[PDB]
Each structure stands twice: as structure tokens, then as C-alpha cells.
């Protein structure tokens, strides 16, 4: 049938692609990557996401149909589209290897600036020095500095209920270094406690479609393995994050 799809890019522009109506996310993604000029190396570093809210975007699963999501969230107004291209990478050294690829650097740079604006990357103490690199468009230098801040390449999920808290919610934060749960109220106001699970402690993990839950079983210190249920509507994205983190850990090619 062939239909139109608009997708937002990290530099704040959008691209339009013609695709078959029933294209799945990877087919749309490859059509976009070719159109914007990604090569065989760079294409592995980005993915298709849906804008859920101002503060959260969720990765499209392989069995989704991006045209369905597009039409369903479409209006005559709406600043663009709910589909967006974002980086999909937890290991920051792999992206340092791309400092000589203009496309990658540009996309990494624009998404990082927006991720600072939104609070994901805690860059406050060097806000001025980053701002002058931003002003001079010293993109690699800006990124080389920013990659040393807290929250670079961390996925933060919206607060939700957890079966291992009597009262209150958790905000989960997934990075290459560990899986973190931040305690907060049922409103989403940060309490002040943080549990940090090492990936080595992770025994198994799973989803519960019926119960709308992501589950993980951890073994800590010396105690018996235990299951924790996080009641997030984004259990499939969370599950994809675990799969991706262990993949990047196996293929880690650096001691630092």
C-alpha cells in the first residue's frame, strides 16, 4: 500500500519515509537509517522510540508496527510526531570510538544537550564550562566532558509500584554499571534511599504480561535468591534493557 511516516531525529529535525503499511520497527528503522546516511557501523547505535511524555520515551519492540503508533498519536497540530530516533547504547567507550564519525557525533551531541536540559545527566557543577563548549560547537570536547557525568547512558523509567515496598514507589535506573532503584512517594517525589544491584547478582528476569510487571530474581551477599516485581507498564522495554546490558557486558573490550 505504501504510506508516509514522519520520525524526529536527535538534531531536532524530522525525516519522512515511504514504507509498507505493515512494516515492523526494524524495517522502518532501516529505511530511516539509509535515508539519513547512517553507515554499517553507525546504524547499530540507534533505534526507534515512542515519545510517551515530556520526560519519557520508550523503545519500540521488534513486533510493533510504527505506522500504527504514528496514526494513533497523530493530530493536525502536535509538534511533529511520536516516533523518534535515539541512541541505544549503554557502554560509553564504544561511542568514544565514534568521535571521528560526523553523523554519530552530531546525533550524540544533540541528544546529550537535550538530556542535560531534561535533568537526566547531572552536569550542574560544570554547567558553565559545558555551556561554553556548547556555544563554540566543540561537539567532541563537549561529549568527552559530559560522558564523565552521572547519568550518562542511564535509562530512567517513570515511577511505579513495587511489590517489595510496603508504601511508596520506585524509579528504576538502568546503566552498564548497575541496576538502581530510587525510593519515592506514590506521587513521584524522591525520598532519599537508593538500592544498587550489581549485574553479577542478577539470576534471572522475566515479564508478566497479565500482571503488567517486570520481574528479576537477585542473590545478594549470602541470602537465598529472591524475586522482585516492578509494576511498570513498560515491562517489555525494561526486559529489553536487561538483555542489552548483558550483551554489552559480554563483549566489553576494555578494562576501564
Amino acid at each position: 500500500s505504501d504510506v508516509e511516516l514522519r520520525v524526529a531525529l536527535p538534531d531536532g529535525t524530522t525525516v519522512t519515509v515511504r514504507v509498507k503499511k505493515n512494516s515492523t520497527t526494524d524495517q522502518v528503522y532501516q529505511a530511516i537509517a539509509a535515508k539519513v546516511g547512517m553507515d554499517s557501523t553507525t546504524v547499530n547505535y540507534f533505534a526507534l522510540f515512542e515519545v510517551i511524555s515530556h520526560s519519557f520515551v520508550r523503545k519500540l519492540a521488534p513486533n510493533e508496527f510504527p505506522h500504527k503508533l504514528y496514526i494513533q498519536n497523530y493530530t493536525s497540530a502536535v509538534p511533529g510526531t511520536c516516533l523518534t530516533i535515539r541512541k541505544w547504547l549503554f557502554t560509553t567507550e564504544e561511542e568514544i570510538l565514534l568521535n571521528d564519525n560526523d553523523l554519530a557525533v552530531t546525533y550524540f551531541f544533540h541528544q546529550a544537550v537535550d538530556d542535560v536540559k531534561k535533568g537526566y545527566i547531572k552536569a550542574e557543577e560544570k554547567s558553565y564550562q559545558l555551556q561554553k563548549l556548547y556555544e563554540q560547537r566543540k561537539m567532541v570536547m563537549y561529549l568527552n566532558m559530559l560522558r564523565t557525568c552521572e547519568g550518562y547512558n542511564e535509562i530512567i523509567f517513570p515511577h511505579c509500584a513495587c511489590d517489595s515496598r510496603r508504601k511508596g514507589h520506585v524509579i528504576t535506573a538502568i546503566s552498564i554499571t548497575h541496576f538502581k532503584l530510587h525510593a519515592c512517594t506514590e506521587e513521584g517525589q524522591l525520598e532519599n534511599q537508593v538500592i544498587a544491584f550489581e549485574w553479577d547478582e542478577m539470576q534471572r528476569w522475566d515479564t508478566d504480561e497479565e500482571g503488567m510487571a517486570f520481574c528479576f530474581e537477585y542473590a545478594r551477599g549470602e541470602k537465598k535468591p529472591r524475586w522482585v516485581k516492578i509494576f511498570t507498564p513498560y515491562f517489555n522495554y525494561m526486559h529489553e534493557c536487561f538483555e542489552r546490558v548483558f550483551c554489552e557486558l559480554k563483549w566489553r573490550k576494555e578494562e576501564y
Partner: peptide, 4 residues
């Protein structure tokens, strides 16, 4: 119970 609570891990928190």
C-alpha cells in the same frame, strides 16, 4: 520484607 521490604528491600527498602
Amino acid at each position: 520484607d521490604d528491600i527498602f
